[PDB]
Amino acid sequence: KKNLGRIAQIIGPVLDVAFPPGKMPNIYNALIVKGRDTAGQPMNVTCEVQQLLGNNRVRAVAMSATDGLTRGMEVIDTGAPLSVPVGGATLGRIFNVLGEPVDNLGPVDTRTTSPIHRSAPAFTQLDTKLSIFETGIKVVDLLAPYRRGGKIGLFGGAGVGKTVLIMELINNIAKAHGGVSVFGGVGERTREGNDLYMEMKESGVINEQNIAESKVALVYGQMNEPPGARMRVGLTALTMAEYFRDVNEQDVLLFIDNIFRFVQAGSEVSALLGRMPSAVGYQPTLSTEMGSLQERITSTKEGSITSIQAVYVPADDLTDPAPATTFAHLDATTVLSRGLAAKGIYPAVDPLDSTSTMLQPRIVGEEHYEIAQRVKETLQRYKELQDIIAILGLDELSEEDRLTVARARKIERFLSQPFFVAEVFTGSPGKYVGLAETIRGFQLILSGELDSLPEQAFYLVGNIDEATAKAMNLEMES
Amino acid sequence: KNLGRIAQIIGPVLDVAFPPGKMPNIYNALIVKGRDTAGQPMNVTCEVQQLLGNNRVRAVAMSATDGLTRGMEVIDTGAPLSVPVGGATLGRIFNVLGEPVDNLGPVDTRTTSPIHRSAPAFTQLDTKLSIFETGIKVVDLLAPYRRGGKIGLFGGAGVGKTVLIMELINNIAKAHGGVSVFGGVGERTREGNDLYMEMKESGVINEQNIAESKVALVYGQMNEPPGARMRVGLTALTMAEYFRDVNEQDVLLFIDNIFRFVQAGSEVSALLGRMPSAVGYQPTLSTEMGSLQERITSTKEGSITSIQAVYVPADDLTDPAPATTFAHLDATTVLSRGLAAKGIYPAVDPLDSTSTMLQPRIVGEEHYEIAQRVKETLQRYKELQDIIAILGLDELSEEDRLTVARARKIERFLSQPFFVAEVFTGSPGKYVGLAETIRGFQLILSGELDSLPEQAFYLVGNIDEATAKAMNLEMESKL
Amino acid sequence: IRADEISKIIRERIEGYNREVKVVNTGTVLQVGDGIARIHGLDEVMAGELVEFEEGTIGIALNLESNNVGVVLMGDGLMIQEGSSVKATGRIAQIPVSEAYLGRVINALAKPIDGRGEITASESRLIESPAPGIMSRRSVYEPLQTGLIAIDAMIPVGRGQRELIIGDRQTGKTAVATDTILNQQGQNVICVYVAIGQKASSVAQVVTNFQERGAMEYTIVVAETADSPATLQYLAPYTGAALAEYFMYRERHTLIIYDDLSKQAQAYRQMSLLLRRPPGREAYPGDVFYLHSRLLERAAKLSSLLGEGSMTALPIVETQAGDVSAYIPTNVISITDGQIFLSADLFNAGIRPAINVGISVSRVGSAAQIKAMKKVAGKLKLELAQFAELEAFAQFASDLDKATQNQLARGQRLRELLKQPQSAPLTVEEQVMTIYTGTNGYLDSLELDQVRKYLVELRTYVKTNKPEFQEIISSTKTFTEEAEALLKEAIQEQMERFLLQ
Amino acid sequence: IRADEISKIIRERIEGYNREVKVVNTGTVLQVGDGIARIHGLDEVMAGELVEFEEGTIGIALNLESNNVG
Amino acid sequence: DSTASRYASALADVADVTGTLEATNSDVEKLIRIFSEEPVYYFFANPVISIDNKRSVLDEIITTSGLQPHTANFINILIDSERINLVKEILNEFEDVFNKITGTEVAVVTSVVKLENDHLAQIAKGVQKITGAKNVRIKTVIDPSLVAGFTIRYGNEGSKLVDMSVKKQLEEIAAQLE
Ligand SMILES: Nc1ncnc2c1ncn2[C@@H]1O[C@H](COP(=O)(O)OP(=O)(O)OP(=O)(O)O)[C@@H](O)[C@H]1O
């Protein structure tokens, strides 16, 4: 219907398309390319503009594999930004970057659709309540409370336990509170995407038959995808979430992992866009794209869009800008230090930087505030003694400092939360703890009730009474 | 004509065009004028460094880029920029282009020396080596200045360098009967304003009657463009140059900071179509410092003693601008974040700071043994303190355990208060004489005053006052 | 109200319009890509003019070549046709200013993003009004208060002095910024919390805290959505600076909170990179130094000739992994009036605020704070520096000297005085009270961990018994013998009260 | 973007191309600044041959590109 | 100050010093007329085909179409120095560079009605008064979106532009809502 014409240049994933000189398309809008293939000329080549580049020519980004098509293909301007199916059609359907159901089910009804991106929600349409809900993982519930409706950041490198922690969190809050619960996979291991899909199928939160009763829209984007596809799947998932917070008007769960792959896709597409580079590798616009994907996550006046986003910290570099923008852009930083996983605690969470503004007396109770304090004081002191105890041994300390090291390691190995989904990984069937345990295990540790049972006697057990029973068992086996 | 257009303006870089009748030489001042945002007759002065073909030239502007629009007239002065110099140009604070920025009446502008000139050859340089005492303890002990040399303040991240400049100016401006000049080269404007207030206070500017002020204030703003800061040091240097050849008196320069000059040059050279260099800077850093530290030379005609602050970024030495600035310095004083963290001021690293004028035959062969002995025990203490921090002083054996406490007293004793820093400390400072310094240090290094507490040496001008504070501390130990 | 009354104002606005002879520079836009607009034609365009598009997403012309003009998109122009008549506006990024801003969340294009309604405004202040002159301005001689104890004590802020809050993230920097805002409740201090490039939920939280504290009646929050275009995201501190110039130029001293400045540098970096302006070191453009210089130098203290107001600045700068040797925390420390650090170690180690005086510093000094506290404890900053060294030295604690034992226990109790609860802005008289309680060694024999309880008991006891101390000294700013006597008297009484018990 | 993007050399060129020969005797400056100069002509110039400048401020030539010698 | 612009400037300046001003003007008119067709332009723009064949074809076209030896020598220098790939914008800016050196100020005054040619001469004299240019090459085209008023556009290419057609409504709808 709109401007037809010819692609003039293709550079790998990125494509430069010329047009009639009269009307050029919008910026940021989409358009398909017919092109060619082996059998048939499908519209599989969807595309999206990025930069109108002179001589009635746009420089655009692709969304699929960019082989087989050539310059001079019959490009079709769809004019609008990239539409995507929304609504109950999403529920349970494992659909893809352009919205089509790749779950080997029916093509979902296009009677309700939405463009891919929109403006930022309003200064007033931000909410006011500092909402807090627990999870069940005691280190989080102790010293990193989760701003529900806000942003919940999962940091760490690789092999430090982030997608496993996401699986545990979704294993809790899939049947816990919260209405529709959209997972998005940005750069996910697609075998692990289908793994959590089968976990949702077996756990039954998604629905085999009558799928429109699911309250889950698992719109993954596999890591195999082209850079434009990874660059857009986050916007798809956020479009689903904002659609539900505006039309379902729901407290929407927004598990996403991991948006470093999103901005890495942005970097590798900018390097072919010819935009000059930035800090150490990335695109110059990483700040603005992270600003888009964060500022379009808010708790509305009616929809507390709680997002549990992960960031792949590359090679454990907190100085790197891909952290250095996000943990400004979010509320609950949860950095997962690798060396704790080397020691063997799962989850491997330091207390010092894993923090929140929810750790506030007038939000969690002054009691829970000082509880988290008296944890954090001791563990920060343990670190500033750690860096000089590892050299030159244990007993050069005072009696007080030795006891403080013992109690800090008590808290540390006591925070070894056994995970309910990690039974098939390690063997131990995980456990669930809450706020009474959150105060009481701390209370016994810091009072000195538990003060003679060894470091294994609270190891990989959440509940402190479970730790006492484990202590009884290990004292019995002698 | 010579009226050309400005084809490209990108930052404070101005690509000026010209008809093929005239394309001027380098370094020549151009002035776009008569236009601003308010229709004002606002002028902007702009000099040239590179001339990129087709009778056109990329210029750098000594004032802000706002106002002037591409396709405007330019009026080259047919010459390099010339700074109004003279005894009438003392007193008032004025601009890089020379305009009196004191907002009262302008100085008489009849003797203008060109801002870019030849550097004096060493056949003109006064090879006379000389000794200078400036009254600050650790300096006149361990980094004794040359009355005629070049003096560097290798400063850290805003620690003691500018307050040290204020103290030293306060101590030596009255001392040197010859002329003086402070160069504000990308200095913080309110701290340069505080310096100007202190010159009004101490009467060195003599606010009620000027041109008898032997000091001369010239300043270039941080907020000014790097085209301004790239030449404000040249302005101050040329005022000192005029006083060093025409007036040929004893001239004192206090430029701050030279790294601001470096950063402005690097800044604009990134823009004016030139490659970068090693970390920080332009590829023209060595020639910039060459022009400067070859023009600030005490001549056989007239002496000069140019002191200058060097702010190294990231507080190091491998940085290339202090890697050439040390190579162009002769009296280097290197401040330390550690000694500032322990409050010891001036937070000089006496290991790092040395001077060419620390020769035994030129300081006195007992003063030299004093200086060597303090540097020896101090360097050994800095060598030992890491093992201290892991194994305990009380373990660390006695033949070094007396020396660690000795040098620990030493550094805090050579922390001495300043007459201006009393706002930061609490007690008004002291102008210490070098005989008193070597006396107190001959007490400490020998180990006569090893009975004194260490904090009795804290922030004290005289060793006699240190004994007095020691008796006071013993008195409060009883009380 | 619908179709009833406004037709007379419609006729008033129509009849009496301009019909101008305004010749304008108008440009056919050639190259828009990713927030910039390299525009063809458009010859006589002033660098810094807003350039009106087809849309209404105006733009500043930063760079300009012989053929093209580097123009940014303040407001992302999502649909701009090639060859659109993109004319400039002539004027140079002017900003409307009024006292009716006092409370409205305002966007960088002077627009109310409060929901309170549009503001009438007369003047049109430039975005690059320079710094006030060198001779024209006075030294920072007059105190300005934090409400936080340790900064006021050791490393003071003065009205006009631009102290630089700095540190790693998530260590209470924005918290102490809001605390030193809402400290100002009767000091005739306008605060301009310029929020830059962070969560709008966070800026909603801080304006919620301001509405709760009542401090939003006089403060002006310049919000910046992180979704805003990076041109706007770096432009907004200049708008905040000119808006504070609007009040400083009358007589009214004011305060400003850039929050943060590192996002300003990054957004400006993004715009300069897309403009193909070549980068300097650390992949930044070189002139973030020049940008922050023009920013912070527009913040100083007036003198009596022009209004003797002030624009004391607090640009928070974000540094990763506690570094100083990052490029923008290397530029801003050179162009600020001293810096204070918020170490993660001292924050999570209980010292909240976490300003270790070993690295933190205020480079204008006690003349920017009160004479009473001056005469009490000018020396206490260096005393605590020595205590910090000696307590690092007291790791080797086997046979400590009795004098250094008194010194370490003294500075220990002093450091315990420098702990304060969350958002408890103490009266400056109370800060004088606790600092004299420290410097006169009453607490030396007392309990070392109950000093906070000693202090709250002492301050309640004096604020009940002898509040005449506070008014006589706040009317004299001077630690006299009357202050001494009232202090030691209530000290004896409350020392008895807390000894028993 | 090209070398000899000065048009004065190109004016001389389009005036006097009409031959298949070089310019070898002397040359003119084509670009100059910061103590270096990209100059045109005198095509036979040895790698490191000294250059007799105008105003005698002589220097050595190392960049000897096609239309312009540095 | 692009490469095409400066090669245009070289050609216009050699025409100005040699007095071949309008001859080279009409010659570049017929030259861009010849370069309008993409076969010969693609023939010259292709770097694969042999340079001696390109030179022979070029000189052949020169001798047959009877052109100026100056622009002939110029385009021989262009095919030599490889800039013949840019001939479109080279000549398209050479016309305007020639107009600049001859001072002729092209001013496209569109409108909704074909104005009286005396009024064209009137506003031509007015814009020569405001510009100081030698000629004002008055250009008109009927624009339907312009309501009624004159809509000039002058300067270098399209820089300075005044309208009286939709600008009245634009002023009204702008200033009313303020
Ligand atoms: N909570 C856990 N309990 C037991 N083992 C774990 C846990 N978390 C991670 N692991 C170990 O880590 C491996 C999976 O990688 P991990 O979960 O550490 O990082 P990740 O979440 O896969 O990060 P990414 O997805 O970014 O690579 C598994 O082989 C498992 O043995």
Ligand SMILES: Nc1ncnc2c1ncn2[C@@H]1O[C@H](COP(=O)(O)OP(=O)(O)OP(=O)(O)O)[C@@H](O)[C@H]1O
């Ligand atoms: N005096 C104090 N006592 C207790 N807690 C404090 C104090 N000051 C600040 N905090 C805490 O510091 C936490 C982090 O606040 P804030 O967001 O200002 O840190 P930040 O480093 O500025 O982080 P960001 O830069 O991301 O905003 C807050 O949750 C607050 O509880």
Ligand SMILES: Nc1ncnc2c1ncn2[C@@H]1O[C@H](COP(=O)(O)OP(=O)(O)O)[C@@H](O)[C@H]1O
């Ligand atoms: N031990 C100290 N003695 C004196 N001044 C100090 C000390 N520690 C910090 N300062 C502060 O450092 C400032 C001077 O730093 P300096 O490097 O001289 O200037 P700048 O900070 O402008 O570079 C003084 O204003 C003072 O407040």
